[PDB]
């Protein structure tokens, strides 16, 4: 009977079991704890742990190598050295419309990592018609990835066909449609806070501790997306160019390991 906080009097919402978890146990049937790699780190199942009611996604200083896509040079690079590994929990089930919420505590270290609660689809390059959306990504929240620790991002990413060309749209390039910046009234690294988003075919509304911190028209986010909790690497350990991250020369172990904690994630679909 558990209902979402945005439920209005007289409404009924249904919890989506496959995209909801109170994290009493590490459920590998529901979550993929070692998804495809990207960025300048690698996911490791061991970096995702569940203890005392919370999911802990840890970023560790851990040298390793893996094939790396060097977008700037449009080439795959074998045995590419990386310096950090991290944790992820990606729902195997997909969806779009509904209310999503996660109770999260950010990592203590800053700057360097970004706790994230988001959802993304697969990229379908077969959709080439004008206006076709090949990729949809809704970021409920991306913490501590800006200059000040209290600045949070509630963004959108997508690929849409414009003038017959698949076009990438990111918060930085198309802020009016893809970016919601917010100055948190608290340090996200202190205690748990609730981050949510209500997705409908027409609107996307973001929430932080019950307050609306963002709203956009749902222009390109109707694709099936996997609900994800993950912690990414950021400056001073990264550089950003050619639409992707690259490692920086700062591979300090100080401040690591560091982890974000998720008390729970709840997803509902309105009746
Ligand atoms: Cl704990
Ligand atoms: Cl971006
Ligand atoms: Cl971004
Ligand atoms: Cl705790
Ligand atoms: Cl409205
Ligand atoms: Cl409005
Ligand atoms: Cl931490």
Curated annotation (Swiss-Prot):
- Domain GH16 positions: 1-271
Subcellular compartments:
Periplasm
Record key words, sorted: Disulfide bond, Glycosidase, Hydrolase, Periplasm, Signal
The SS bond pairs are 72-242
Report which reactions are catalysed by this protein.
Answer: Endohydrolysis of (1->4)-beta-D-linkages between D-galactose 4-sulfate and 3,6-anhydro-D-galactose in kappa-carrageenans
Q: Name one GO biological process term.
A: carbohydrate metabolic process
Catalytic residues in the record: 137 (nucleophile), 139, 142 (proton donor)
A Gene Ontology cellular component where this protein is annotated is: periplasmic space
Task: List, in alphabetical order, the Gene Ontology terms for molecular function in this entry.
Answer: kappa-carrageenase activity
What is its EC class? Answer: hydrolase
EC assignment: 3.2.1.83
Which residues of this protein are annotated with the site description Important for substrate recognition?
234
Q: Which family does it belong to?
A: Belongs to the glycosyl hydrolase 16 family.
Q: What is this protein called?
A: Kappa-carrageenase
Organism annotation:
Pseudoalteromonas carrageenovora
Q: Which residues of the full protein are shown?
A: 27 to 297 of 397
